[PDB]
Amino acid sequence: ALDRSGKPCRKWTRGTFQMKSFTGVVWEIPRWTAPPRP
Amino acid sequence: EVAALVIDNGSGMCKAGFAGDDAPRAVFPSIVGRPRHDSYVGDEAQSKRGILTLRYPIEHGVVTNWDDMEKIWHHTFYNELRVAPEEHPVLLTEAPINPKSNREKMTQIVFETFNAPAFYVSIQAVLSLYASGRTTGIVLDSGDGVTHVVPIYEGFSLPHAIARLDMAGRDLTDYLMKILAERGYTFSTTAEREIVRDIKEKLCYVALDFEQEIQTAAQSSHLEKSYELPDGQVITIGNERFRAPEALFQPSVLGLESGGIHVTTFNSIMKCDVDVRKDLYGNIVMSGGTTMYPGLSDRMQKEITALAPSSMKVKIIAPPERKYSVWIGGSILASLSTFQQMWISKQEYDESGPSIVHRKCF
Amino acid sequence: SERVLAREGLERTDNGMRQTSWPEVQPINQKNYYTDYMKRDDQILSLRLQNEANRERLVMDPSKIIVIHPGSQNLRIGFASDALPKTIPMVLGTQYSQTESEMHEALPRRQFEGRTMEQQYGEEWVKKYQKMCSDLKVTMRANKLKVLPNSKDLVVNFNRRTEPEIISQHNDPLQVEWTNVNKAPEDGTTQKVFIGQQALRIAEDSSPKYKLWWPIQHGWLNEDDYPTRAHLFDDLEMLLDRALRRELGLTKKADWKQYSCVIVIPDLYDKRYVELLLHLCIEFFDLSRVAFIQESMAATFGAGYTQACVVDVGAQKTSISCVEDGLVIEDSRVNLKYGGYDVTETFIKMMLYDNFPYQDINLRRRHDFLLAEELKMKYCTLSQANISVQAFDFHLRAPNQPTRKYQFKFYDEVILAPMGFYDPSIFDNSTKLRGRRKLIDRSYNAYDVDMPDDPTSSAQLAILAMVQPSQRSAKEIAAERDAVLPIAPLDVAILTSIQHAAKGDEKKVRELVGSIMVVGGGAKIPHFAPFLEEKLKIRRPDLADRILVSRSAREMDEQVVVWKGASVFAKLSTNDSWVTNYEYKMLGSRCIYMKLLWHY
Amino acid sequence: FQSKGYNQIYDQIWRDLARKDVSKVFRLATDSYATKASNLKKTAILASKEAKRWQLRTNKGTKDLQARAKRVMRDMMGFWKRNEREE
Amino acid sequence: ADIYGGDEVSALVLDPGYCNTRAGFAGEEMPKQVIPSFYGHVDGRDLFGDEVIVPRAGFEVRNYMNRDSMVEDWDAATRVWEYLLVQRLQPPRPTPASKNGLNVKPLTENPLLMTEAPWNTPKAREKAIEVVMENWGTPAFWLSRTPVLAAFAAGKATALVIDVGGANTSVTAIHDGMVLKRSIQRSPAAGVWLSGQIRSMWKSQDPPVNVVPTFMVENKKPVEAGAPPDCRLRNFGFPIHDSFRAFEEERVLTEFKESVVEVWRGPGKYLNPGNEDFAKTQPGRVFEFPDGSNQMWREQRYRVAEGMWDETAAYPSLNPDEAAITKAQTIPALIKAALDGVDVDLRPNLLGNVVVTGSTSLLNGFNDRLNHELTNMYPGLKIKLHAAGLTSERRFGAWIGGSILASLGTFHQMWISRKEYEENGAGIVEKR
Numbered sequence A: 001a002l003d004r005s006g007k008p009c010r011k012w013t014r015g016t017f018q019m020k021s022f023t024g025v026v027w028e029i030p031r032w033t034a035p036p037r038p
Numbered sequence B: 001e002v003a004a005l006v007i008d009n010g011s012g013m014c015k016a017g018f019a020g021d022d023a024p025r026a027v028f029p030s031i032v033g034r035p036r037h038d039s040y041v042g043d044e045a046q047s048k049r050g051i052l053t054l055r056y057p058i059e060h061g062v063v064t065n066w067d068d069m070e071k072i073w074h075h076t077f078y079n080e081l082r083v084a085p086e087e088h089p090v091l092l093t094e095a096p097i098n099p100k101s102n103r104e105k106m107t108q109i110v111f112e113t114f115n116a117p118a119f120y121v122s123i124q125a126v127l128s129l130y131a132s133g134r135t136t137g138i139v140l141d142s143g144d145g146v147t148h149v150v151p152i153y154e155g156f157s158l159p160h161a162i163a164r165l166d167m168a169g170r171d172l173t174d175y176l177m178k179i180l181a182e183r184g185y186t187f188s189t190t191a192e193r194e195i196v197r198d199i200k201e202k203l204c205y206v207a208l209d210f211e212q213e214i215q216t217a218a219q220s221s222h223l224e225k226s227y228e229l230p231d232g233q234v235i236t237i238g239n240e241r242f243r244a245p246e247a248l249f250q251p252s253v254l255g256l257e258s259g260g261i262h263v264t265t266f267n268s269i270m271k272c273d274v275d276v277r278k279d280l281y282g283n284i285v286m287s288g289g290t291t292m293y294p295g296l297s298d299r300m301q302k303e304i305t306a307l308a309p310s311s312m313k314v315k316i317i318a319p320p321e322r323k324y325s326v327w328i329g330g331s332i333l334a335s336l337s338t339f340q341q342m343w344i345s346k347q348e349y350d351e352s353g354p355s356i357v358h359r360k361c362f
Numbered sequence C: 001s002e003r004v005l006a007r008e009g010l011e012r013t014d015n016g017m018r019q020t021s022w023p024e025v026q027p028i029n030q031k032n033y034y035t036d037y038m039k040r041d042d043q044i045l046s047l048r049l050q051n052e053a054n055r056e057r058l059v060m061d062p063s064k065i066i067v068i069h070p071g072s073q074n075l076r077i078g079f080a081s082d083a084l085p086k087t088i089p090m091v092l093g094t095q096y097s098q099t100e101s102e103m104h105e106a107l108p109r110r111q112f113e114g115r116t117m118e119q120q121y122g123e124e125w126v127k128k129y130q131k132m133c134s135d136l137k138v139t140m141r142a143n144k145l146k147v148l149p150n151s152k153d154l155v156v157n158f159n160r161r162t163e164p165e166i167i168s169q170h171n172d173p174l175q176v177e178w179t180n181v182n183k184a185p186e187d188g189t190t191q192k193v194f195i196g197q198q199a200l201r202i203a204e205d206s207s208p209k210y211k212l213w214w215p216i217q218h219g220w221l222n223e224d225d226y227p228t229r230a231h232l233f234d235d236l237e238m239l240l241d242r243a244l245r246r247e248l249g250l251t252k253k254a255d256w257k258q259y260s261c262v263i264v265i266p267d268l269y270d271k272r273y274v275e276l277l278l279h280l281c282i283e284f285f286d287l288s289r290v291a292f293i294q295e296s297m298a299a300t301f302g303a304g305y306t307q308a309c310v311v312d313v314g315a316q317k318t319s320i321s322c323v324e325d326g327l328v329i330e331d332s333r334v335n336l337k338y339g340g341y342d343v344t345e346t347f348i349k350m351m352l353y354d355n356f357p358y359q360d361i362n363l364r365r366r367h368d369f370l371l372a373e374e375l376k377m378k379y380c381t382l383s384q385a386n387i388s389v390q391a392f393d394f395h396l397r398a399p400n401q402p403t404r405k406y407q408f409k410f411y412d413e414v415i416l417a418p419m420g421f422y423d424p425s426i427f428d429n430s431t432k433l434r435g436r437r438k439l440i441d442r443s444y445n446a447y448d449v450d451m452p453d454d455p456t457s458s459a460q461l462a463i464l465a466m467v468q469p470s471q472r473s474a475k476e477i478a479a480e481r482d483a484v485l486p487i488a489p490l491d492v493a494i495l496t497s498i499q500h501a502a503k504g505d506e507k508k509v510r511e512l513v514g515s516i517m518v519v520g521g522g523a524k525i526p527h528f529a530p531f532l533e534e535k536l537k538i539r540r541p542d543l544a545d546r547i548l549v550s551r552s553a554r555e556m557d558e559q560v561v562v563w564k565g566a567s568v569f570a571k572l573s574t575n576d577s578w579v580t581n582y583e584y585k586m587l588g589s590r591c592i593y594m595k596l597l598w599h600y
Numbered sequence D: 001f002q003s004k005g006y007n008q009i010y011d012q013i014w015r016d017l018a019r020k021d022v023s024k025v026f027r028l029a030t031d032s033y034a035t036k037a038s039n040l041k042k043t044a045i046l047a048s049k050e051a052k053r054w055q056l057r058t059n060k061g062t063k064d065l066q067a068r069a070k071r072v073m074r075d076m077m078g079f080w081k082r083n084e085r086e087e
Numbered sequence E: 001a002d003i004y005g006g007d008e009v010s011a012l013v014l015d016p017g018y019c020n021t022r023a024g025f026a027g028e029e030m031p032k033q034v035i036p037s038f039y040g041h042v043d044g045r046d047l048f049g050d051e052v053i054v055p056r057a058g059f060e061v062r063n064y065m066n067r068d069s070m071v072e073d074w075d076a077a078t079r080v081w082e083y084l085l086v087q088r089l090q091p092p093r094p095t096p097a098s099k100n101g102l103n104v105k106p107l108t109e110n111p112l113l114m115t116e117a118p119w120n121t122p123k124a125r126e127k128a129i130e131v132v133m134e135n136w137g138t139p140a141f142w143l144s145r146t147p148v149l150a151a152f153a154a155g156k157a158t159a160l161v162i163d164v165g166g167a168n169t170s171v172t173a174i175h176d177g178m179v180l181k182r183s184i185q186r187s188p189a190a191g192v193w194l195s196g197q198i199r200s201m202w203k204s205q206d207p208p209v210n211v212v213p214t215f216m217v218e219n220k221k222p223v224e225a226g227a228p229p230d231c232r233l234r235n236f237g238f239p240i241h242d243s244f245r246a247f248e249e250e251r252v253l254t255e256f257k258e259s260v261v262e263v264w265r266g267p268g269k270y271l272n273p274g275n276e277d278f279a280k281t282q283p284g285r286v287f288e289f290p291d292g293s294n295q296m297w298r299e300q301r302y303r304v305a306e307g308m309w310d311e312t313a314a315y316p317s318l319n320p321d322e323a324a325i326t327k328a329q330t331i332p333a334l335i336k337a338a339l340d341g342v343d344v345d346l347r348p349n350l351l352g353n354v355v356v357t358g359s360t361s362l363l364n365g366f367n368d369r370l371n372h373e374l375t376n377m378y379p380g381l382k383i384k385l386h387a388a389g390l391t392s393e394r395r396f397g398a399w400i401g402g403s404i405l406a407s408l409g410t411f412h413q414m415w416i417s418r419k420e421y422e423e424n425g426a427g428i429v430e431k432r
């Protein structure tokens, strides 16, 4: 089906994600993030 | 059940309306105004231009200010179509080879700002091909802001073979003002640009042999058509009638270093697979407002025949509805029962975020 | 091992990623599908706007409707409120390097300085003129009319032994007025161009030099005479612009947006000509609406007939169509490339052969054209009882040269030129097809760009098959038919058109044959309807009890029955066939398919 | 970097990447492309039929057009029965 | 966590070559942007794309790649890669309100995967990361070899990669996703050499065949086979540059290669005693030059391709400097010399997984000849050939391998970070 009765979607925002090389160096990639849904 | 909205935004004119209709309900300039020292859209912004700074949010077919773009969509739903988006699926269109970041950004705005229950993005040229009644071809799409050539085989475009002549409707208006200034009329004001656009869309045509029309234009009482300004005074334009559209075939006259539309079309066919090329020459399709000049198809048939091999069967398709082929292809798509199982649902947006559009819209 | 790698800080890692980002597309189910596209009239712009208009009406001024009937000699134009059209020659004069007379061989065609008259006129034509003479003699002898054996000899000897009289400028009963090409126009426009009667009366030797352009000939766009499609379209636009300014007095162009237009088209139209006319009206003139009606439909609407076989004889075309229940019967349409202009040229050629005094006559020269039309309207006749050696005179008036009077005699040239409609090989058909698709191609489907979309009829193919007995594609078949000029005797064309209309139903043949209606100026020859009824009766002796041919309807001029019918079609409330300005700006020629009252 | 430990890790990552991941993701990608191309082809066949269908003549279309034409013609007979009686 | 979407890493994949340069995002079946490596120069301005090469008074055509398939000019390389990766593949900036006529660092989100030739020397690799990290604000970088990517494009861990490009033909053995450095073998007998064979073969014909490019022809009429052309040329106020003329003639030569030329696939070499005599009796293939000139090609169709299989068969170079190819530079010689550089245990594995690549490998009969030559030179082994690519489109091979690689989750531990570079400066030598 389509919508319930409107009601908003959860907001997405450009955050940052820490990720790691096999030689242990840590770097940041920009990534979409949302607050945790109950 | 309710119809989807089909929205076809453009550097010049927004088109909007309900899927299943054969024509838009609404067409208005893609213009927004803010106070110089509240905001306005389309012809209300044109009317009040004295107290506004006026801007186009779409440039060369790509969205370049998302603040102004959001005002245009707000106007389209609530003032033009008189519908709440929360009830209706939305089919949007995008320019060939536009950036991946922009597909995400429009996907966010329909779900977070309009609460569209379901949504799709579609490549303009491919919509125009469906409208033209075929599955394979090459689309010359030429509007206000950009001219693209787009090869398509069995419903799938070939993006490496897409070529982009960075010159179209607005460049020809500015050129027509320059050569009418060389005939002694005065044109350098936004009111005067809207006058010269109205001259171009009535009096201009494409010569079948440009050097022979230059040769014969020296004396013809038939050629020198005339036009009455809003002021009531009268102007008379002659060789300027066919000199303006010649800039599509010779962009040198307009002072830019590029192949014209016939050469760029040949080049796009010659970047495709050898077994595909017969089917591309047999199906050259013309789309967008700048393809409406009288005699254009006849010059394309002659110009592409000079480049192509003598064994090829070149055919130009230019139907009557071709200034709205992109909208019409949208309407047809979004009215198929198959579209219900092709759109991004707002549940998929809740779980996957803006990047869902790359997984689901090709 | 592992803890030494961890001590060096080296460790392989998922980074919490999935195996791959590579997109996994699900297959679309395409079974049991349906569509919602153009399924309801509210979704079709043309029909939505009509429903909105019908509501706005229920919840139009004839003086605001222009009625246009273009042609190869004459344009007829007026408001639907007018009792009668304004008629002008459909011709345009512009400044040029050369006159129409300088660019081409003289008419009628003669091989000047040939060995003998048999070559000069052409041996086939001379044999056919002699055949027609002998057949007329046998016919009127069988009817027991007088035939003096020396009748042609008296004519030839008198014409050969006669010379003109020069008349003093004031003793001439009619001082000619030539068009002053130097004079500034006063119709809200600046270009010194002339239309209609003013253009024909431009002197051949005016100080700035003028050429006359006829944008329509043989009943289709005159591509032969034009160098480009742009020039031809610029002239049909210029002619109709000046006709609205000069015949209808619509001097202020800004006000034209409030007028609508009814255009009369041929029953075998060219879709490119229909689409040119709709584009002139809505893009160049900006009229509010346009509607189209076919010549045969408009003819019956002039009369007030439900069911009729319409014969329309013109300057350059003759058309036959049956009409019934509001529709032209699509298979019945025949369209022949001769008319009353052929009768003018054939009369002049027959008289020139019979030593007619003014041997230097050339129908490409404007005063000679007007003289030949005037001679033909006075003397040519299909009443056989009128015939004897007759003696008359005409004044040759020519620019900057004194009036000359010629006495001349004639005997049968006056009947044999008309009788060409029953042996049309006597007409000069040699150049009619020259230029036929030189600038404007055949109509092809908007989508299926290989398939011809121009109309066809069983009857017109049956006529082409008489001229030339006729795997090939649709373009090859079309191009093969386009090479054949449709020429048939008028009695054979009528009976074949009706036979196709009735599709072998003898009872519809009997109805249509009792309902033949003649219109157009070429039919305006004396005794034409009686002559045509006699010719049909000897070709179908079974139908002689019921063949009935009538000239015009409700006491109108043959030349205006069609315009009167078009003006009724403008007025009547049930007509929803209008293409509105806005529909056309959205969808162009596509809205014709939606709104016309026949399958376009 | 210049040690048997580093060399072993680097080689062991590439061995698993080449043997396990590249072989799986190539099969997924080749099947995915075949689904995408199939989806698009059949959709373009439906959308192109719809674009042309307004042109196809039908029982209903022809009878409604015969009815339009017959009403207009009866209104023209009405027109004369008034004017030819009132004149 | 449960805070993250389907978004992971959007990597840019870059593949520069002597003929073509190709750019795009990973996770996509073909490159979005494909442009000639030949670029226009006019008035200090540099002009990129097949669409911007057009006759003008100053116009000169240059290349930023050498015929070693390596960057010759790092300035020009930076301008070409700026055009593809920044102007074409990212969002634009808006025009000012004063200029629209109504009123009277760039790669921070996308790590870059760059493709190199397998003989690319370490100084060049050092300059690639130096140029990439300084210009564009790229988060992280990777630099990989064309043969590895072509094997992953065929879905293979271990393969023998035959790669027939423009400037070079290469043979190389890949095992467990890595290049066996002893197996690398290279040759000029590739697409650019095949164009010189065709030019030579055309000037050797009894009436010479003269190539004249499409830009020089206004209008042409069809004519019978062997007849002089009914055609009218343009003229220009300015003299045309020899480089421009050459670049435009290479479009005609590429159309001759894709449609006339055929590799002799038949039993034995083309110059075996019966074979050329038989070839003259076959039906030919027709071809039209842009001038309208038209002819049927019979045996010369075979003889231009044969030289990369048999050094005896080749036409002389029209350039008198460009030395004739030797036996050691033919394709069968490179294959034998490549597998002789590998452990005898791997040979049946490698020859069961032959991967063919490079646009010159698309000639009619190429795979049929290769299969026959392998079968006759390694008898009693199963030989099988694989195309690089997901699709019947085989012009992109390395690029699709980069696309698959940079989309694997296990790969994201490999990228050299911005920080990793800033601490070390020449991390490449040890990280690949």
Ligand SMILES: Nc1ncnc2c1ncn2[C@@H]1O[C@H](COP(=O)(O)OP(=O)(O)OP(O)(O)=S)[C@@H](O)[C@H]1O
Binding pocket: B009, B010, B011, B012, B013, B014, B060, B061, B141, B142, B143, B144, B145, B146, B147, B168, B169, B170, B197, B200, B201, B202, B287, B288, B289, B290, B291, B292, B293, B323
């Ligand atoms: N009948 C016509 N003849 C010639 N030019 C026309 C005509 N109608 C519109 N145009 C021009 O076409 C342009 C608008 O074309 P569209 O295709 O609607 O523009 P658009 O969709 O905004 O453009 P893009 O390509 O999508 S940015 C303007 O430059 C108009 O002046």
Ligand SMILES: Nc1ncnc2c1ncn2[C@@H]1O[C@H](COP(=O)(O)OP(=O)(O)OP(O)(O)=S)[C@@H](O)[C@H]1O
Binding pocket: C070, C071, C072, C073, C074, C075, C218, C219, C313, C314, C315, C316, C317, C318, C339, C340, C341, C344, C373, C376, C377, C520, C521, C522, C523, C524, C525, C526, C559
């Ligand atoms: N009184 C008359 N006697 C004989 N012929 C006449 C008479 N009045 C007009 N005509 C002829 O009628 C012809 C003109 O007929 P029209 O119907 O006006 O032609 P038209 O409509 O321009 O031709 P079409 O129908 O467009 S081909 C000319 O050839 C005249 O010579």
Ligand SMILES: Nc1ncnc2c1ncn2[C@@H]1O[C@H](COP(=O)(O)OP(=O)(O)OP(O)(O)=S)[C@@H](O)[C@H]1O
Binding pocket: E016, E017, E018, E019, E020, E021, E069, E164, E165, E166, E167, E168, E169, E191, E192, E195, E253, E254, E257, E258, E358, E359, E360, E361, E362, E363, E395
């Ligand atoms: N279909 C075709 N058949 C044969 N040759 C072709 C075809 N298409 C292109 N070519 C030739 O292919 C060559 C270029 O091959 P590519 O694979 O693009 O070379 P590239 O990758 O730029 O070259 P390198 O070797 O990597 S520097 C040119 O010499 C073209 O003329």
Ligand SMILES: [Mg+2]
Binding pocket: B009, B010, B011, B124, B143, B144, B288, B326
């Ligand atoms: Mg557009």
Ligand SMILES: [Mg+2]
Binding pocket: C071, C312, C314, C520
């Ligand atoms: Mg008429």
Ligand SMILES: [Mg+2]
Binding pocket: E017, E165, E166, E358
């Ligand atoms: Mg390569």
